[PDB]
Design a protein around this ligand. Structure first.
Ligand SMILES: Cc1cc(CCCCCCCOc2ccc(C3=NCCO3)cc2)on1
Lengths: 57, 245, 242, 296, 242, 57, 245
């Protein structure tokens, strides 16, 4: 059927790859889901504020 | 309601009237280890209040010529407090941190410190100057504990990487005309659920003056910088005897 | 056997070819993946993070490398003096190379999108002042004075509690994408120039430093994207890794 | 029956707070129409870098803008997209006359930090999990193809490392070997994420020994055993002298990548493998330099 | 023919590649498979079977090889003396090599799970005694005395009808798996140490031997698993098989 | 259709293999069922006892 | 109700008051040959009680220096009893066994014997010491019948395999402070439904002192070890004249 053993196993992203062997890590890199989360690095702030506001109230 | 703040953990409370919000490392609050993420089969100790509190470890003096300092973390807090103990008696350790760096001056002083959290902060040597010698940074430099260590080539963070980019890391600045303290809240970050608090340092705390301290003569010239950190969601497992290193 | 006819390209090893291959370890099952903080999905997540722009990329004394990170601004004695100036091109040699964005660009042949450059003032609380940051689109020669610079996109920055101000360098281009701009001919892809003038003057009371610095930080706007990746040029080693 | 502070005690919450969510970013953000805004109280352009967050000022609030439907893709900037490109990571010599690797066999310690291009790319992140496709391009030093049979054997840490061309370990009864003629197209193989950790670690700030940590041992600082994948051994398949000088170039291409904790890009030249040392006297700036901040 | 383009890896013979191949005997039908006792399905079935642990891996006289299988314990004259000590690492050189588990490990690069070590006392029925078996996790240096050893995982064994007691060496590790531990650097993967101290003393009446032996037997717990197999190192022949 | 002539014929385990010839012994080794029986070698005792109990009553 | 036991087969009954449970080889009771497992088309003989019984074949003396002994099985029981006969007259033989090794001492004695069942126990020679000579173990050594044979290099079971691992085989120990006998019940084990009881030995019985016999002087020093085995589900086919070997 196919072993579920690739590096992106259980990942939150959905990949569609092609493979010819029992082991899924052999499969192609394939096309995948395009999600992002800039705020994790750009706005890791505890209390969000808006651009419209004055950052320091 | 954004420049003033109070942090309370354990039996310690920090007050600040000029802070500039709180940064939460990689946007994630410190959590305990999941049942499916863990491997250590023994039930761990979660001392809670006895170790999750504010240890005010060190003070440096900022001078018109200071280069900058760093503190490796897991380690910095060993030997000091009940946290220290649980870190020596146990093999495995896990915990997030609330780092609060403070430094004040007058409205007539000026300067700006960069305060960052660099995960897996590996230190490098100048390689004997020329680059032919394969030297290695000493225990006294890679794991300075409290007291931290002073940078010798801040431009490259003594590790061949531009400080100009150090901001892709949970950071905060201490601009004297704006604030008087930084507050970062880092979650536990490693490729393992637990690791030895002793020989592995999850990240380093960097405090570098990017815009030099300066003030007309006559104004108090002793401008300290004090580090105060607090572990969060501390967990320990693998109990044996006490170990120093 | 089933009739087949091999086409050109046979046996070739194409670096970027994404196909399959016999797996070395049958039934191997990797170490479960724990949950780890700060996972990245797309490099664009990084291009939006502000990093220090070395506007003052002049010093090289190795004992003065740290002063590239910020440029000075001090009490002027006149009207509309020029503070600093720089190419608003990201993948080009210059200040933009000290940035994270700059570096990631070196990996992609072309890009598109608006850029933002926040300027934080680090002077004393007592110092006042109004600067005029001006982005002059392509074809516009480096302005000779403020009165000329202001004819392009600009913003009058006022010093106050809000230390910094951001100058957005809108994506204003004839083309949909821009290959890296580089002097000869490829200056076709130049983004333009940024200049900082004194809107009024740096004012200070008796007792405060007569000179302070500004730190520039830059990144890309939400509409920023890059395509066709290559290798960086900015760097290449010399000695072989021991 | 309980003590309250125990009923509350949020000690033991395995789930991470978050604060941020992942949204779909197939194309670049579109630009909606903007108009003049002359009002007190709302100041987008004003920010506070001290907070530690990147300015959130939109083009729209900085100038009157038109409407633009941005359909530019972001697919090429994904990790698989960025990292899944074969690159040189290892090189091996099997010369006839010399002191490097005669006897007809070689043991290459599997360490991808020996080649600057590839190294810098990955050192962009602290942790990285992924599968890979290794390709082996062999030939003589002139790039000439020769009718020679080699044997590549992956030797996991613990397995017996071959001591000679005719060593017994070449029976490869459980290790995975590959037999190839230099005339056959380069051998290529799929490799899983094999590590006891959850992700390979480019930087390990600490030691592995747990002992004294004297001067003579500072050699181990930064050495993380969860990356020591073992060695790659190769040998001309025979009993006698190979007859031709050989070279094997090892190309690795990552796939099914997961990366975490981005860090500053390498600024200086590289000097050694698994060791961020830099030339103390030759610390060059990150970029180019001008003559003055007021001129180009 | 049908258009095809051969990719790299073509013609390569990969030991562990599992594919098909032309069968030599068409229509061949194998001898029916009878029912046979003790069939194995997974090597893990074997790793849970206890085998003798050579804790006393000291003698080599070839006439004394048999005394490696058991260590002695005899009437002490003091308080808390040290009986025996050993590395709790399975795939490492030492006592664990005499075990079946030890041997199967040599075939797999990494492992995970708790280990069990049952100690059977073979002294006379009249002999009494309480031993303290202690497993000291990683980082813990070989205990200098009982009072120190006991600070880790342990168990006070009392001699009675139930000859043996088992010491479980719980999987206490920072990593999910462990590669084989081996002195230099790889001591990172060490499991810890096991030490046996005298909780009280070996007591005997007039007429019974003043010294008896304990035989150690070890195996893996139910949660034990191994991954990524390689070849054993423990052994490799010298002369070629005649 | 395919000859039923592999070594694991009639076995109690279920294998999913790939094959291109009439004879099933040519087929790949394939992914298979993961069952075990430790007690056959660990507890081949006639009268089971539990851990909780004292092995010799 | 676990240390005392009684085994009754045929017209023989063994009693024991210090046994330590019963091991059933590979967890399988001896069975007769299935109709689809067999090939011999002739209807076999199943003497039942005349051959399925307890033959007490031998006694060895355990001494403070004994090395250990073994008995090859199918064979051991030939020439002795009706079983012997059916094994000589018939070509094909099939049967499981109930092996009961006994050895008692006082509460003041001490020692421990390992009692294992090693299937297909092939014996090997020391190869002339140096290892250059391709010697072979003699009929007197590979098929000693009753009386068994004494091991010369028990550490390797005279066959180059560690005795330390011999426990992956149906075994039981005779620790004198605990019990006074072992009881293994092996099923028929071969790659064939039937085979010649004469020239093929399905398994060997090993009895090795791992923890040496010892006792203060004055206590009876003659400590015997007696073997008692009983065939189970014996089946014979292929009747011809009687054959010795
Ligand atoms: C057939 C066959 C296939 C092979 C080679 C298999 C190689 C698998 C390699 C996986 C490598 O993962 C790495 C992770 C980290 C590092 C590293 N070097 C410095 C510290 O990090 C190197 C490799 O050999 N024979």
């Amino acid at each position: 059927h196919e072993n579920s053993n690739s590096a992106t196993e259980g990942s939150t992203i959905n990949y569609t790859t092609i493979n010819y062997y029992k082991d899924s890590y052999a499969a192609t890199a394939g096309k995948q889901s395009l999600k992002q989360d800039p705020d994790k690095f750009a706005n890791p702030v505890k209390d969000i504020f808006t651009e419209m506001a004055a950052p320091l109230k | 309601s954004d420049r003033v703040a109070q942090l309370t953990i354990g039996n310690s409370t920090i007050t600040t009237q000029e802070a500039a919000n709180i940064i939460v490392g990689y946007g994630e609050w410190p959590s305990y280890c999941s049942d499916d993420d863990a491997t250590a089969v023994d039930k761990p100790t979660r001392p809670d209040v006895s170790v999750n509190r504010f240890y005010t470890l060190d003070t440096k003096l900022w001078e018109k010529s200071s280069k900058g300092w760093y503190w490796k973390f897991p380690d910095v807090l060993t030997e000091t407090g009940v946290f220290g103990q649980n870190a020596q008696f146990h093999y495995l350790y896990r915990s997030g941190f609330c780092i609060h760096v403070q430094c004040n001056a007058s409205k007539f002083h000026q300067g700006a410190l960069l305060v960052a959290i660099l995960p897996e902060y590996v230190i490098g040597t100048v390689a004997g100057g020329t680059g032919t010698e394969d030297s290695h940074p000493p225990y006294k430099q890679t794991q300075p504990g409290a007291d931290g260590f002073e940078l010798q080539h801040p431009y490259v963070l003594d590790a061949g990487i531009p400080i100009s980019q150090l901001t892709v890391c949970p950071h905060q600045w201490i601009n004297l005309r704006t604030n008087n303290c930084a507050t970062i809240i880092v979650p536990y970050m490693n490729t393992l659920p637990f690791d030895s608090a002793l020989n592995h340092c999850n990240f380093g705390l960097l405090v570098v003056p990017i815009s030099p301290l300066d003030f007309d003569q006559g104004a108090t010239p002793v401008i300290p910088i004090t580090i105060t950190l607090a572990p969060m969601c501390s967990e320990f497992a693998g109990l044996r005897q006490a170990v120093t290193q | 056997g089933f009739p087949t006819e091999p086409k050109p390209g046979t046996n070739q090893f194409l670096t970027t070819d994404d196909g399959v291959s016999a797996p070395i370890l049958p039934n191997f099952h990797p170490t479960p993946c724990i949950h780890i903080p700060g996972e990245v999905r797309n490099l664009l997540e990084l291009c939006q993070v502000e990093t220090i722009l070395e506007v003052n990329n002049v010093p090289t004394n190795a004992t003065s490398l740290m002063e590239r990170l910020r440029f000075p601004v001090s009490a002027q004695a006149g009207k509309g003096e020029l503070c600093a100036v720089f190419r608003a091109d990201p993948g080009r040699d210059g200040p933009w190379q000290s940035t994270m964005l700059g570096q990631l660009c070196g990996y992609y042949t072309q890009w598109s999108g608006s850029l933002e450059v926040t300027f934080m003032f680090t002077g004393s609380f007592m110092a006042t002042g109004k600067m005029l940051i001006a982005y002059t689109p392509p074809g516009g020669p480096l302005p000779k004075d403020r009165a000329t610079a202001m004819l392009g996109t600009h913003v009058i920055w006022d010093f106050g509690l809000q230390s910094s101000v951001t100058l957005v360098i809108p994506w204003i281009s004839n083309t949909h994408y821009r290959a890296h701009a580089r002097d000869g001919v490829f200056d076709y892809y130049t983004t333009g120039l940024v200049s900082i003038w004194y809107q009024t003057n740096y004012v200070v009371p008796i007792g405060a430093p007569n000179t302070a610095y500004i730190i520039a930080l830059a990144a890309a706007q939400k509409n920023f994207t890059m395509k066709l990746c290559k290798d960086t040029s900015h760097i290449l080693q010399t000695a072989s890794i021991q | 029956d309980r003590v309250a502070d125990v009923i509350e005690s949020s000690i033991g919450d395995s789930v991470s707070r978050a604060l941020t969510q992942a949204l779909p970013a197939p194309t670049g953000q579109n630009t909606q129409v903007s108009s003049h805004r002359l009002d007190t109280g709302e100041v987008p352009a004003l920010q506070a870098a001290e907070i530690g967050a990147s300015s959130n000022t939109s083009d729209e609030s900085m100038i009157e803008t038109r409407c633009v439907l941005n359909s530019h893709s972001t697919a090429e900037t994904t990790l698989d997209s960025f990292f899944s490109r074969a690159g040189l990571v290892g090189e091996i010599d099997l010369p006839l006359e010399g002191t490097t690797n005669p006897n007809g066999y070689a043991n290459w310690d599997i360490d991808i930090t020996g080649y600057a291009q590839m190294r810098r790319k990955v050192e962009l992140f602290t942790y990285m999990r992924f599968d890979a496709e290794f390709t082996f391009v062999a030939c003589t030093p002139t790039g000439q193809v020769v009718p020679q049979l080699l044997q590549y054997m992956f030797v996991p840490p613990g397995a017996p490392k071959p001591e000679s061309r005719e060593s017994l370990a070449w029976q490869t009864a459980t290790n995975p070997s590959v037999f190839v003629k230099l005339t056959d197209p380069p051998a290529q193989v799929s490799v899983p994420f094999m590590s006891p950790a959850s992700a390979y670690q480019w930087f390990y700030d600490g030691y592995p020994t747990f002992g004294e940590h004297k001067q003579e041992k500072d050699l181990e600082y930064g050495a993380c055993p969860n990356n020591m994948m073992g060695t790659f051994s190769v040998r001309n398949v025979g009993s006698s002298k190979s007859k031709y000088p050989l070279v094997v170039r090892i190309y690795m291409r990552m796939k099914h990548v997961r990366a975490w904790i981005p860090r500053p890009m390498r600024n200086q030249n590289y000097l050694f493998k698994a060791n961020p040392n830099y030339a103390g006297n030759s610390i060059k700036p990150t970029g180019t330099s001008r003559t003055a901040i007021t001129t180009l």
